[PDB]
Design an enzyme around this catalytic site. Structure first.
Site, PDB file in Angstrom:
ATOM      1  N   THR A  16       0.982  -1.223  -0.193  1.00  0.00           N
ATOM      2  CA  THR A  16      -0.424   0.035  -0.251  1.00  0.00           C
ATOM      3  C   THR A  16       0.961   1.481   0.205  1.00  0.00           C
ATOM      4  O   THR A  16       0.491   2.254   0.036  1.00  0.00           O
ATOM      5  CB  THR A  16      -0.826   0.025   1.477  1.00  0.00           C
ATOM      6  OG1 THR A  16      -0.427  -0.188   2.568  1.00  0.00           O
ATOM      7  CG2 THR A  16      -2.084  -1.390   1.059  1.00  0.00           C
ATOM      8  N   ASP A  39       7.610 -11.716 -27.974  1.00  0.00           N
ATOM      9  CA  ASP A  39       8.415 -10.585 -28.113  1.00  0.00           C
ATOM     10  C   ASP A  39       9.336 -11.041 -28.680  1.00  0.00           C
ATOM     11  O   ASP A  39       9.268 -11.706 -29.669  1.00  0.00           O
ATOM     12  CB  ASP A  39       8.633 -10.204 -26.346  1.00  0.00           C
ATOM     13  CG  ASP A  39       9.407  -8.541 -26.746  1.00  0.00           C
ATOM     14  OD1 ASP A  39      10.595  -9.253 -26.821  1.00  0.00           O
ATOM     15  OD2 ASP A  39       8.668  -8.305 -25.644  1.00  0.00           O
ATOM     16  N   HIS A  69      15.453  -8.153 -24.503  1.00  0.00           N
ATOM     17  CA  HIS A  69      14.306  -7.691 -24.299  1.00  0.00           C
ATOM     18  C   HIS A  69      13.404  -8.727 -23.878  1.00  0.00           C
ATOM     19  O   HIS A  69      12.662  -8.625 -22.931  1.00  0.00           O
ATOM     20  CB  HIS A  69      13.539  -6.497 -25.714  1.00  0.00           C
ATOM     21  CG  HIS A  69      12.517  -5.871 -25.238  1.00  0.00           C
ATOM     22  ND1 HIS A  69      11.044  -6.713 -25.044  1.00  0.00           N
ATOM     23  CD2 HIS A  69      12.388  -4.424 -24.485  1.00  0.00           C
ATOM     24  CE1 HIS A  69      10.160  -5.459 -24.448  1.00  0.00           C
ATOM     25  NE2 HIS A  69      10.423  -4.607 -24.442  1.00  0.00           N
ATOM     26  N   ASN A 161       5.956   4.466 -25.285  1.00  0.00           N
ATOM     27  CA  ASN A 161       7.282   5.292 -24.696  1.00  0.00           C
ATOM     28  C   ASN A 161       7.570   6.745 -25.352  1.00  0.00           C
ATOM     29  O   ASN A 161       8.560   6.403 -25.251  1.00  0.00           O
ATOM     30  CB  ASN A 161       8.357   4.118 -24.632  1.00  0.00           C
ATOM     31  CG  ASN A 161       7.987   2.743 -24.220  1.00  0.00           C
ATOM     32  OD1 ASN A 161       7.736   2.878 -23.062  1.00  0.00           O
ATOM     33  ND2 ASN A 161       8.473   1.657 -24.422  1.00  0.00           N
ATOM     34  N   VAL A 177      -8.539  -5.278 -24.095  1.00  0.00           N
ATOM     35  CA  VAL A 177      -6.934  -5.710 -23.920  1.00  0.00           C
ATOM     36  C   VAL A 177      -6.625  -4.972 -22.780  1.00  0.00           C
ATOM     37  O   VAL A 177      -7.241  -3.388 -22.565  1.00  0.00           O
ATOM     38  CB  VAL A 177      -6.065  -5.692 -24.705  1.00  0.00           C
ATOM     39  CG1 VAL A 177      -6.803  -6.968 -25.068  1.00  0.00           C
ATOM     40  CG2 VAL A 177      -5.428  -4.537 -25.033  1.00  0.00           C
ATOM     41  N   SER A 224       7.013  -1.686 -21.749  1.00  0.00           N
ATOM     42  CA  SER A 224       7.469  -2.285 -21.691  1.00  0.00           C
ATOM     43  C   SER A 224       7.862  -4.058 -20.529  1.00  0.00           C
ATOM     44  O   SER A 224       7.469  -4.751 -20.059  1.00  0.00           O
ATOM     45  CB  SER A 224       8.767  -3.162 -22.395  1.00  0.00           C
ATOM     46  OG  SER A 224       8.569  -2.741 -23.918  1.00  0.00           O
ATOM     47  N   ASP A 260      -3.021   7.626  -6.363  1.00  0.00           N
ATOM     48  CA  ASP A 260      -0.906   7.314  -5.531  1.00  0.00           C
ATOM     49  C   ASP A 260      -0.238   7.560  -6.508  1.00  0.00           C
ATOM     50  O   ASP A 260       1.076   7.841  -5.978  1.00  0.00           O
ATOM     51  CB  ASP A 260      -1.334   6.189  -4.960  1.00  0.00           C
ATOM     52  CG  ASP A 260      -2.044   5.905  -3.356  1.00  0.00           C
ATOM     53  OD1 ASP A 260      -2.109   6.848  -2.797  1.00  0.00           O
ATOM     54  OD2 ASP A 260      -2.637   4.390  -3.314  1.00  0.00           O
TER      55      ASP A 260
END
Ligand SMILES: O=c1[nH]c2cc(Cl)ccc2o1
Length: 279
Positions: A16, A39, A69, A161, A177, A224, A260
């Site tokens: 938390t 990938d 990756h 990104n 998705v 990723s 948060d």
């Protein structure tokens, strides 16, 4: 269970609060689930995978991961030290070359492959797919992601990104998705993370330690890296019987740490993946 001195992202999805370093989780650990990592492949021989990883499909001359990756992402799903779901089965589908690039037509083929191939695997607790890839908007790529989800696979995809609205990227922009943004260890949206209404959840994505090729490890950043946290989380929760592939994204959003994160644009969800495990 408790893993001391865990990577910060592991500790974060069982906490938390930011700023702790132990990962707490139910010992079932995703046993009986399966996660496809679509990938650059997976170095299945890495000791961190404990024989639980294997390559099932490649579209190139080798199924080996010549980049790293895919091995890193797979390590965040399910490696013994770096993984969310430490007993899941990992299935690698190499749709990206060793430079990390792949044609959309190959990526689509890989997604339809998983939708069928799950019927050749033993996954009584359920099936997840982790897609740390994308490019510009394509309705055909989105449709492939929606078919995979519809087939009974929990699809988690990277938001991208570009520090931009993920509506313009695929499969990030597919509504059905689970589109995953990136956060850092101080609960800030990662500098590079895409945003927007299509995002469903954030996971740890800045400075993520995981497995690498050559039996090694390294820390890298990206959406990723956030995506496999969410994919591993889904496998873990499905093994616990708390959710299903069709419902897992909504369940993770329902049970997330809320409000948060900082630097979340107005209109983007402020939800951080959380396993709600009570030790
Ligand atoms: O153009 C791009 N690059 C991308 C990389 C990831 Cl991981 C996701 C979406 C993308 O869109």
């Amino acid at each position: 269970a408790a893993q001391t001195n865990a990577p910060w992202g592991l500790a974060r999805i069982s906490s938390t609060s930011p700023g702790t370093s132990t990962y707490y989780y139910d010992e079932s650990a995703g046993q009986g689930s399966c996660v496809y990592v679509i990938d650059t492949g997976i170095e299945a021989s890495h000791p961190e995978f404990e024989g639980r990883a294997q390559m099932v499909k490649t579209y190139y001359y080798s199924s080996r991961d010549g980049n790293g990756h895919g091995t890193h992402c797979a390590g965040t799903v399910g490696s013994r030290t770096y993984g969310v779901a430490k007993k899941t089965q990992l299935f690698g589908v190499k749709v990206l070359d060793d430079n990390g690039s792949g044609q959309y037509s190959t990526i689509i083929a890989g997604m339809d492959f998983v939708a069928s191939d799950k019927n050749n695997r033993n996954c009584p607790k359920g099936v997840v797919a982790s897609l740390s890839l994308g490019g510009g908007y394509s309705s055909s790529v989105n449709s492939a992601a929606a078919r995979l989800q519809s087939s009974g696979v929990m699809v988690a995809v990277a938001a991208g990104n570009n520090n931009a609205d993920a509506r313009n990227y695929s499969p990030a922009s597919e509504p059905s998705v689970c589109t995953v943004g990136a956060s850092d260890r101080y609960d800030r949206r990662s500098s590079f993370s895409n945003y927007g209404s299509v995002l469903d959840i954030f996971g740890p994505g800045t400075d993520i330690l995981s497995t690498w090729i050559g039996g090694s490890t390294r820390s890298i950043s990206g959406t990723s890296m956030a995506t496999p946290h969410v994919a591993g989380l889904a496998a873990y929760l499905m093994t616990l019987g708390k959710t299903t592939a069709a419902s897992a994204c909504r369940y993770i959003a329902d049970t997330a740490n809320k409000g948060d994160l900082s630097n979340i644009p107005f209109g983007t969800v402020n939800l951080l993946a959380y396993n709600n495990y009570q030790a």
